[PDB]
């Protein structure tokens, strides 16, 4: 009773090609998963990190490159602008012959780059006010600096849209890299000599005089001013709570509680925020309600910009757009970026300019990219029996709560109701294959030259910030997918309460209708329940089955989920990190995937004996001395295995809200005693420990 099929071989290969049975499954099971991928797959030049979602990733866009790069006589027009847009991308030739010259061009409306401008003050100095720089860069460009102001939905309203002001994102991948002492050290010099490679390569443009000495006084100035503004930031751990982050109050309020003088000159919010919503025709009163996600940084940023000139603020400013639009001029440009990507991310080579280009056409037209990707590489078969392994994961999580005594009667009745309105999305919305009509409308007022790539990311900045910026006197569309189908990912959206499964991760070793059931279960089984769990995790368990930010535990049932899920923080918080110099995982900021994976593995493998109770045991796999339930925590930690770069490892532990592939397959395997009774792993052994952490 062993399976014959050439699937079978084919999975039982793949299993066998990634495992390492020299090692003990209950001393490290990461190690018996995943030491065959280790010991094969090394990380390409071009990636930071690698494992099997990367490689997924890698193989989609060959997909996507070959369903863009061929013209078809029969192409709607949502697909050939898709392909102009790629083609246009593609064209090396092109865009070389061009030099600078598009940057040049748009400069002037931003208000300039000072370091790379003639008598800056003189040609901008005189008309420039903090409203409206800022308020450029948003409204046209969608680029957020200084000050974070976005149309969102309330989270306190789902189905109603408000104005947010945030702090902002900063040019490194972190506040922590603004210390500049230590492991951070060559990303500051990087990112200051980036700055200067640029102003350098505008002025030999423009043939102005450079000024060695003066072009590092400026931009070492710029990076002085940030690291301020970082300073300022609030920390991710005091930002992880979304009721004391949500503070509504009126632009009059802010007006009085949040005073800024910029260039000498009372930052007035109102003229801020007309000078932004004016680009989509709606006025605004010192009545609108808006809310502010960062209090404390707007307070912090007083007494900074009292100490910096418009020249000061702009130099920052401009550079910020500047750095997201090298990778869209001349080979010359972007080898000042590839050297900062490396001392940043530790990779030597720049991405496929094709691959870059068909993830840039699937970001922009997700929904044209996800048609071509879906009629290319997804079954059909797929969408109807990963909806049925959603109906009883779902029903698994219901059946859960009856066991879970830290909970009352009257909060488990509040969570399955949450639980039964969970909107699922599996693949793709059928609309992109079947209506041609409302896929065009989408991108109607989008028209690309081939021979300007420039000119088209540019005007896909302002199509982008246009469509949500007038969206706030609009109602939420409850229509709409958080996820384009050529994704390899799952999502959680808890402002919406609902769990996507693009196409893109419905293939093995997730999903196949070919492979063993025991496979889909411990694969995209455990991918659902995460998504599911992510609803009850330390945030999204402060959000109601409508998606709006309102406390349904009583006082007791969220003390006992913060002791349960408190354990987690204390286990993952003791793990040390080998690739980042053996630091610790910081437990708070992987809380939320923590719990979603322990309370996902144990929900899908519920689910998996309850299908073995109705249907029965199925055939073994040839070459593997392996039963079922262990097949099902193998592909578990197969589908997570990877490796990461120790230079981006080191950096990563302190921000990272996963914790590492590793980690996520010890962790989760340490608090299952299903896994310890499937290896029948001797009590305290590494896998097996007495103590053992849950909340779903
Ligand atoms: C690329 O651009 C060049 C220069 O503008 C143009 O002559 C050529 O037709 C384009 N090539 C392709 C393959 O699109
Ligand atoms: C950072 O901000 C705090 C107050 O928010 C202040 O005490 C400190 O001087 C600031 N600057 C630096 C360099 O830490
Ligand atoms: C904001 O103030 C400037 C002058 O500082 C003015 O020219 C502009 O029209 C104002 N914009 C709005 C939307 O009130
Ligand atoms: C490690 O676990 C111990 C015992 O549970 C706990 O006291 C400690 O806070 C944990 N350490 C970290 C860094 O989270
Ligand atoms: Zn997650």
């Known amino acids: 009773g062993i399976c014959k099929s050439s699937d079978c071989i084919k999975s039982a290969a793949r299993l066998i090609q990634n495992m390492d049975a020299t090692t003990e499954p209950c001393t490290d099971f990461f190690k018996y998963a995943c030491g065959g991928w280790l010991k094969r797959n090394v990380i390409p030049e071009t990636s930071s990190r690698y494992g099997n979602f990367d490689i997924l990733r890698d193989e989609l866009e060959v997909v996507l490159k070959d369903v863009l790069q061929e013209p078809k006589t029969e192409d709607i027009v949502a697909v050939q602008k898709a392909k102009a847009l790629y083609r246009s991308c593609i064209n090396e030739s092109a865009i070389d012959s061009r030099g600078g010259e598009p940057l040049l061009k748009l400069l002037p409306d931003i208000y300039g780059w000072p370091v790379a401008t003639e008598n800056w003050e003189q040609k901008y100095g005189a008309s420039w006010t903090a409203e409206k720089a800022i308020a450029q860069l948003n409204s046209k460009y969608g680029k957020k600096v200084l000050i974070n102001l976005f149309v969102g939905t309330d989270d306190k309203n789902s189905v109603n849209h408000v104005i947010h002001i945030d702090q902002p994102r900063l040019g490194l991948p972190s506040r922590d890299y603004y210390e500049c002492t230590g492991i951070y050290k060559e990303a500051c010099t990087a990112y200051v000599d980036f700055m200067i490679s640029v102003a350098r390569l505008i002025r030999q443009e423009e043939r102005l005089p450079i000024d060695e000495n003066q072009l590092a006084l400026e931009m070492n100035k710029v990076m002085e001013l940030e690291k301020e503004i970082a300073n300022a930031t609030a920390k991710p751990e005091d930002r992880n709570d979304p009721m004391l982050l949500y503070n509504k109050m009126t632009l009059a309020q802010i007006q009085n509680n949040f005073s800024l003088e910029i260039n000498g000159k ?26 502010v996600y960062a209090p404390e940084y707007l307070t912090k940023l007083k007494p900074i910009l009292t100490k910096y000139s418009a020249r000061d603020l702009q130099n920052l400013m401009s550079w910020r757009f500047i750095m997201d639009l090298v990778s869209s001029l001349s ?34 037209m997700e929904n044209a990219v996800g048609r071509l990707y879906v009629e290319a590489a997804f079954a059909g078969e797929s969408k109807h029996v990963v909806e049925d392994l959603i109906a009883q994961i779902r029903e698994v999580f219901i059946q859960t709560l009856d066991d879970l005594t830290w909970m009352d009667a009257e909060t488990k009745k509040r969570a399955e109701e949450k639980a039964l309105a969970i909107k699922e999305r599996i693949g793709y919305p059928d609309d992109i294959v079947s209506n041609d009509n409302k896929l065009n409308n989408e991108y109607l007022e989008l028209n690309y030259k081939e021979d300007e790539y420039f000119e088209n990311i540019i005007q896909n900045l302002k199509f982008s910030q246009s469509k949500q910026l007038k969206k706030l006197r609009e109602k939420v569309d409850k229509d709409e997918w958080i996820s384009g189908a050529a994704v390899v990912n799952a999502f959680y959206s808890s402002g919406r ?22 496979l889909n279960y411990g694969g995209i089984g455990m991918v659902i329940g995460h998504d599911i769990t992510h609803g009850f995790d330390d945030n999204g368990r402060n959000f109601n089955k409508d998606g709006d930010l309102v406390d349904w535990w009583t006082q007791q049932s969220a003390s006992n989920f ?77 589908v997570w295995c990877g490796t990461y770069r120790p230079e981006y490892a080191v950096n990563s532990i302190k921000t990272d809200v996963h914790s590492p592939g590793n980690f996520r397959i010890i962790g989760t395997l340490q608090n299952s005693a299903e896994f310890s009774e499937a290896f029948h792993c001797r009590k305290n052994s590494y896998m097996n420990p007495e103590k053992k952490c849950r909340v779903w």
Request: aromatic letters at 14%; hydrophobic letters at 35%.
């Open 331 to 364: 080979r010359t440009y972007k080898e000042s970026r590839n050297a900062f990507r490396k001392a940043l991310y530790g990779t030597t080579s720049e991405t496929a300019t094709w691959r870059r280009c068909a993830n840039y056409v699937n970001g922009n």
């Open 562 to 638: 913060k002791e349960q899920s408190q354990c987690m923080v204390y286990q993952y918080g003791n793990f040390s990190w080998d690739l980042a110099g053996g630091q610790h995982l910081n437990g708070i900021n992987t809380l939320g995937e923590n719990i979603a994976d322990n309370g996902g593995l144990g929900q899908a493998y519920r689910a998996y004996q309850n299908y073995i109770k109705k249907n029965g045991e199925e055939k073994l796999l040839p070459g593997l001395d392996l039963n079922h339930k262990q097949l099902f925590f193998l592909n578990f930690a197969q």
């Open 497 to 518: 309460n609902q769990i996507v499964f693009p196409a893109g991760i419905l293939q093995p070793p997730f999903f196949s209708a070919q492979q063993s059931n025991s």
């Open 266 to 291: 009372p930052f007035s919010w109102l003229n801020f925020t007309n000078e932004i919503m004016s680009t989509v025709n709606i006025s605004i009163t010192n009545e609108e309600d808006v809310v």
